[PDB]
Amino acid sequence: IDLKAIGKLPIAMRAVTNYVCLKEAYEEQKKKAADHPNRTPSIWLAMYRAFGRPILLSSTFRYLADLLGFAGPLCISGIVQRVNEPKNNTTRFSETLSSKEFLENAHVLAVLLFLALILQRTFLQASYYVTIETGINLRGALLAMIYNKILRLSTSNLSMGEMTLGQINNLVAIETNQLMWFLFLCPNLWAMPVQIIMGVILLYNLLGSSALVGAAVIVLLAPIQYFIATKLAEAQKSTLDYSTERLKKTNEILKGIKLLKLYAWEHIFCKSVEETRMKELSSLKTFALYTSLSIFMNAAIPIAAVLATFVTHAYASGNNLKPAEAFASLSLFHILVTPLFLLSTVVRFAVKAIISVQKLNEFLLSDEIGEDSWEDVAIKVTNGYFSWGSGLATLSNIDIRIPTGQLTMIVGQVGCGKSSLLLAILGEMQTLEGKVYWNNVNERSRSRYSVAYAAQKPWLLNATVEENITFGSSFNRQRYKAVTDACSLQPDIDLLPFGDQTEIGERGINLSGGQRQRICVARALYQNTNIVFLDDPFSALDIHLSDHLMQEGILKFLQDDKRTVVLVTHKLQYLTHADWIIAMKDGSVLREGTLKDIQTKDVELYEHWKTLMNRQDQELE
Amino acid sequence: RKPRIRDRLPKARFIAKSGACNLAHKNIREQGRFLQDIFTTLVDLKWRHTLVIFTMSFLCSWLLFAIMWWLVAFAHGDIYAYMEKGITEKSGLESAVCVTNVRSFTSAFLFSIEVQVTIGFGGRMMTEECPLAITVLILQNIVGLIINAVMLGCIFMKTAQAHRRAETLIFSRHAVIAVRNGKLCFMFRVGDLRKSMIISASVRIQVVKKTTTPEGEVVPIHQQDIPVDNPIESNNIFLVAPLIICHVIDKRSPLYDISATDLVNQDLEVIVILEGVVETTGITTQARTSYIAEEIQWGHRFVSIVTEEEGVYSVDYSKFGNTVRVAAPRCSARELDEKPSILIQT
Amino acid sequence: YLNWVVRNLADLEVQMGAVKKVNSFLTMESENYEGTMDPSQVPEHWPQEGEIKIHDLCVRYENNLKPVLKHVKAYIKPGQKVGICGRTGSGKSSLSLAFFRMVDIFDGKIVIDGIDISKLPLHTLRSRLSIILQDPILFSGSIRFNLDPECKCTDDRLWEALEIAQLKNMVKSLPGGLDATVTEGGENFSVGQRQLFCLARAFSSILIMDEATASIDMATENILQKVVMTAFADRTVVTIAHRVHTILTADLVIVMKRGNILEYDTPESLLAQEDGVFASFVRA
Ligand SMILES: Nc1ncnc2c1ncn2[C@@H]1O[C@H](COP(=O)(O)OP(=O)(O)OP(=O)(O)O)[C@@H](O)[C@H]1O
Ligand SMILES: Nc1ncnc2c1ncn2[C@@H]1O[C@H](COP(=O)(O)OP(=O)(O)OP(=O)(O)O)[C@@H](O)[C@H]1O
Ligand SMILES: [K+]
Structure with a gap:
């Protein structure tokens, strides 16, 4: 496995082509899109002109290759008919006139056949080699586009949360592969009649009058394969679903290895599974039938068919079967039969490509556009909505303003809004409606470009947190290395799996929800220019007697540094310095004062909350 | 990992x-690959390749000088003098056949073999008429001895390196x-x-x-x-x-x-x-x-x-x-x- | 046809190489079961209040099946239901020694089980066992098809699941029904009891324990009450545990030796005066 071959060619071809070619396609298609959505708006029109791969550049070669190949057998016949001639009858001494003398000689024809054969093979191979070199580029483009269109627009998902991995299941490797295959296979559909159509005409031109019958059967033989394909596919799909059931059942069975290893259900656990196999086996038999039949259809109809022509040879009433009359007919029959399988495959490939383009169109027209519209304080905005997704209302007296380095936490889970507010404070949620008025400068992404965060679900990002420590870290980075050596190894000293601390994360198979939240908080720790943003994780990550240890690591991290640390937590176990809080109930920031000033207003919920008894844990239980 | x-x-x-x-060396001042380099590659070949180059060289030299001899026995009006079958060879004695009994390229090739490898079957000798033939014979023998010596040196040096x-x-x-x-x-x-x-x-x-x-x-x-x-x-x-x-x-x-x-x-x-x-x-x-x-x-x-x-x-x-x-x-x-x-x- | 020939040769090579990946595990069997034990009654009785003594310096096993490579004297209490001290150093070895076999571990003369132990019919003897997984998750059905042996047990509705109280929530007053389980869940949809009703499964009389790792302490105490209800049916059991939540009210205990029980001593202060539960006293 040499990587030397790769060189720098991909950058010049695939990296450059994918990004640049579709830029033109987007420019043209969008430019047309402005006129009207009745006819103009579409997706696949741009690619032909924008990529501009000369398919024709090959298509021309493809047509040429088909013509040369179909010509070949007539040259084979030519030599054969003139097997015997003395040809000294006129005592010819005439220099062979180019118009006639050259075509006839037996010797020439053989060399011509060799040249034509080599040329045809070479031209064909080269044309679709270039075509493949273009297909690969198209695939790289399609992938580049799926990521470019998945990154900068679809950040906030509210309905796509029903099936978002369907796209990454189909458009990952079922769509791009389909388009690459369809582009690489178009020339067969494009120039098969130019050869076939030639055969009947050629056969009619030279075989005699039975040629029409002679090729009649194969034109219907091919639809036999086109018909067997669909039934075989249906059987295969049913078999696959049954196989999925078998695999799931087998997974459950092996998932109980210690239970079934010796207990009274040791061999019992496979019982239905065996029938399952047998059940699935039955479907396989059905599928096998069509496949075998299809081969027979592809292995007999030609032979059968050619016999028919010689039967229709008795409809010619000529002198006899001139061996220079039927050998070329058999050659044409054995050459014509090739592109038919390609045509039958293209028949299904077109449907696959159409389905793929429809799925892509649905994705790029399903909230993929419009979900991301186009001490360093930013917020003076009256607009009310601080609601999730494309949700309805809940907008009253909205405004917010917070001097950073303040632990403002809207402690409340009922009518919570903790995720909508946490995402919308940095603007990433569709709550920026109204007027956005900020300072004149950060010292237009809502004057919050210096962000850092933690999620409200287990993150588990690429590789692992041990390998997530890639922030310019050969060994130690002063702000987090210390927390890296001693705050990072604090939550779980070591996982059960081997390798301990180093590269611990890379190939780290699993995690605990407590370890997941600890790792998330740790990735919050190893950030630079620490102005951290947290979203109520410590009502579920409530590790008793370890939440203080995590908060003390963050203490030496943020309360022993010059840094802003915030949180919207829902537990009062960590309510130290919990001065600022909200109980909005479907509103923006409207509750802000001193540590005890809220209790000054003597709100009954505040009065019950602000008591000594366990910080009024569970309303002072 | x-x-x-x-x-x-x-x-x-x-x-x-x-x-x-x-x-990986690069940016160096490669002056070229002068002729003598190829000869060194001749020394360090393997037996199959050395045997092939050996036999091919001998055969190429033989065929080439046979073609030359064929031309020579053509230009001197020798092949025609033999082709005259008025008798077994009616006037083939006085015409000073430049190389005795050289009839066609096959025969000339037999003569090339006979004169390069020092066999000398006698049936076909150089004669006292055509100086051009004598010039080509001298050239033949000089090139023959040099090629023989060089190929012998090659084979020997592949023998003397059998300790390694x-x-x-x-x-x-x-x-x-x-x-x-x-x-x-x-x-x-x-x-x-x-x-x-x-x-x-x-x-x-x-x-x-x-x-x-x-x-x-x-x-x-x-x-x-x-x-x-x-x-x-x-x-x-x-x-x-x-x-x-x-x-x-x-x-x-x-x-x-x-x-x-x-x-x-x-x-x-x-x-x-x-x-x-x-x-x-x-x-x-x-x-x-x-x-x-x-x-x-x-x-x-x-x-x-x-x-x-x-x-x-x-x-x-x-x-x-x-x-x-x-x-x-x-x-x-x-x-x-x-x-x-x-x-x-x- | 040449392109076909070359490509098909490559395809055949790849296919046979893929096959050889599992043809090495085609028919290998490495745990035989050929027993010549004579017929035994094998009822569900308690023989003599369960005297368990089979190991005196449990020797090094063989065949690389997690052997214990030291000596651990074993001597437990006869009608003992609670656990006895087994230190982490040898705790895993003891845990593997509760019911799992080995090559040369603890083999020898024993006064236990009233029947031959290692030569019993290996196809059926194993049905008489009982164990519990460390963190019990049984992805199988075990409810809809809980009666894989032919029983009309007639107590999975409300009778002994509620009496076991482990499945009372899921059985006596639940609409799941006699035919519904949890898909790959011992805690997915049935979180009230990852371990089913033991009496219902017997509706034997020997319990084997596991370490409290993922079960809530209150629920564990309720399970302990259920363990007491079952102890009315056993009054002799083997248990393995290291924490006080499981080793709080242990009825019969022992004074151990370096990793295995050395002598029988139920109380706790006597073990405290000696080296009995000094390691256990580390928390109280
Ligand atoms: N992913 C989502 N799907 C549906 N509704 C949502 C989602 N995120 C937020 N909402 C809506 O936003 C409002 C505010 O939600 P809130 O932030 O209180 O949830 P939460 O308290 O984070 O949830 P949890 O209590 O599990 O942490 C809720 O009424 C909810 O209906
Ligand atoms: N009896 C021997 N014959 C040939 N080579 C040997 C022999 N003993 C050692 N070597 C060489 O020593 C090198 C390292 O040997 P090592 O001490 O690792 O024994 P090894 O683990 O059997 O080696 P290897 O894994 O290469 O078989 C190997 O490259 C091997 O070629
Ligand atoms: K020497």
Whole structure:
């Protein structure tokens, strides 16, 4: 496995082509899109002109290759008919006139056949080699586009949360592969009649009058394969679903290895599974039938068919079967039969490509556009909505303003809004409606470009947190290395799996929800220019007697540094310095004062909350 | 080791375990490939190719000068004089057939063979008329002797280089580090397969590492030697049975810093280059091996490979790299060296 | 046809190489079951209040099946239901020694089980066992098809699941029904009891324990009450546990030796005066 071959060619071809070619396609298609959505708006029109791969550049070669190949057998016949001639009858001494003398000689024809054969093979191979070199580029483009269109627009998902991995299941490797295959296979559909159509005409031109019958059967033989394909596919799909059931059942069975290893259900656990196999086996038999039949259809109809022509040879009433009359007919029959399988495959490939383009169109027209519209304080905005997704209302007296380095936490889970507010404070949620008025400068992404965060679900990002420590870290980075050596190894000293601390994360198979939240908080720790943003994780990550240890690591991290640390937590176990809080109930920031000033207003919920008894844990239980 | 999986290219391997110098030179002043170079490639061919070039050269020379002779026996009006079948050969005597009884290119070719390889069948001799033929005969013999000599030299030199078969010097695929005689020791095993001895043997162990300097310079691939720890400070070694060539390190050598955890991330690489002249051939040979950080199975100790048979010692070669993991202190490279208050940090 | 020939040769090579990946595990069997034990009654009785003594310096096993490579004297209490001290150093070895076999571990003369132990029919003897997984998750059905042996047990509705109270929530007053389980869940949809009703499964009389790792302490105490209800049916059991939440009210205990029980001593202060529960006293 040499990587030397790769060189720098991909950058010049695939990296450059994918990004640049579709830029033109987007420019043209969008430019047309402005006129009207009745006819103009579409997706696949741009690619032909924008990529501009000369398919024709090959298509021309493809047509040429088909013509040369179909010509070949007539040259084979030519030599054969003139097997015997003395040809000294006129005592010819005439220099062979180019118009006639050259075509006839037996010797020439053989060399011509060799040249034509080599040329045809070479031209064909080269044309679709270039075509493949273009297909690969198209695939790289399609992938580049799926990521470019998945990154900068679809950040906030509210309905796509029903099936978002369907796209990454189909458009990952079922769509791009389909388009690459369809582009690489178009020339067969494009120039098969130019050869076939030639055969009947050629056969009619030279075989005699039975040629029409002679090729009649194969034109219907091919639809036999086109018909067997669909039934075989249906059987295969049913078999696959049954196989999925078998695999799931087998997974459950092996998932109980210690239970079934010796207990009274040791061999019992496979019982239905065996029938399952047998059940699935039955479907396989059905599928096998069509496949075998299809081969027979592809292995007999030609032979059968050619016999028919010689039967229709008795409809010619000529002198006899001139061996220079039927050998070329058999050659044409054995050459014509090739592109038919390609045509039958293209028949299904077109449907696959159409389905793929429809799925892509649905994705790029399903909230993929419009979900991301186009001490360093930013917020003076009256607009009310601080609601999730494309949700309805809940907008009253909205405004917010917070001097950073303040632990403002809207402690409340009922009518919570903790995720909508946490995402919308940095603007990433569709709550920026109204007027956005900020300072004149950060010292237009809502004057919050210096962000850092933690999620409200287990993150588990690429590789692992041990390998997530890639922030310019050969060994130690002063702000987090210390927390890296001693705050990072604090939550779980070591996982059960081997390798301990180093590269611990890379190939780290699993995690605990407590370890997941600890790792998330740790990735919050190893950030630079620490102005951290947290979203109520410590009502579920409530590790008793370890939440203080995590908060003390963050203490030496943020309360022993010059840094802003915030949180919207829902537990009062960590309510130290919990001065600022909200109980909005479907509103923006409207509750802000001193540590005890809220209790000054003597709100009954505040009065019950602000008591000594366990910080009024569970309303002072 | 997925990080190493994606790091398969990032690797400090200056010399491949085979021994070659995995490197890359570029931007050099390649003057060209002068003619004589090709001749050197003629010497260093293999038997199948040498035999092919030999036979092809002889046949090409024969055919070429046969074609020349054919032209010569054409121009002198010789082939026609023979073709006149008024008699068996009516007027073929006086016409001074330039080369006697040369009838057609096949016959001329038989004459070429007969005149180059010194056979000389006599039936077809050069005559006293055509000086051009005599010129071509002189040219034939001169070129024949030069080609004969050159091909003989080629075949001989492929014969006189039959002493060389292959270098066979064997290392322990792995290193070993341990504690011996009270202090930390670095080991390695060296063995030989050839019956013949290796005279004036010597070994050298070097550390290759990227260095830094207080003045500010950095030498990217820095090499520094290390002692080979023999009893009287001498890089000599007798090689009858395989042995263990231990370069124990105190302070001057760069092993003071070594910490057991660091070995995975260690950047130092050990290179071993030993050499000597073979007794029965006269050629100076040199064998080199590389000890990368991934192959240094720390803490082990080597096994014993010498047994008393009936009257003569027996020796194994299967157990070369097999080790018994004798317990040893950890990271004592500085702790034991910079002796603590106990002065026995182990 | 040449392109076909070359490509098909490559395809055949790849296919046979893929097959050889599992043809090495085609028919290998490495745990035989050929027993010549004579017929035994094998009822569900308690023989003599369960005297368990089979190990005196439990020796090094063989065949690389997690052997214990030291010596651990074993001597437990006869009608003992609670656990006895087993230190982490040998705790895993003891845990494997509760019911799992080995090669040369604890083999020898024993006064236990009233029947031959290692030579019993290995196809059926194993049905008489009982164990519990460390963190019990049984992905199987075990409810809809809980009666894989032919029983009309007639107590999975409300009778002994509620009496076991482990499945009372899921059985007596639940609409799941006699035919509904949890897909790969011992805690997915049935979180009230990852371990089913023991009496219902017997509706034997020997319990084997596991370490409280993922079960809430209150629920564990309720399970302990259920363990007492079952102890009315056993009054002799083997248990393995290291924490006080499981080793609080232990009825019969022992004074151990370096990793295995050395002598029988139920109370706790006597073990405290000696080296009995000194390691256990580390928390109280
Ligand atoms: N992913 C989502 N799907 C549906 N509704 C959502 C989602 N995120 C937020 N909402 C709506 O936003 C409002 C505010 O939600 P809130 O932030 O209180 O949830 P939460 O308290 O984070 O949830 P949890 O209590 O599990 O942590 C809720 O009424 C909810 O209906
Ligand atoms: N009897 C022997 N014959 C040939 N080569 C040997 C022999 N003993 C050792 N070697 C060589 O020594 C090198 C390292 O041997 P090592 O001490 O690792 O034993 P090993 O683990 O059996 O080696 P390997 O894994 O290469 O078989 C190998 O490259 C091997 O070629
Ligand atoms: K010589």
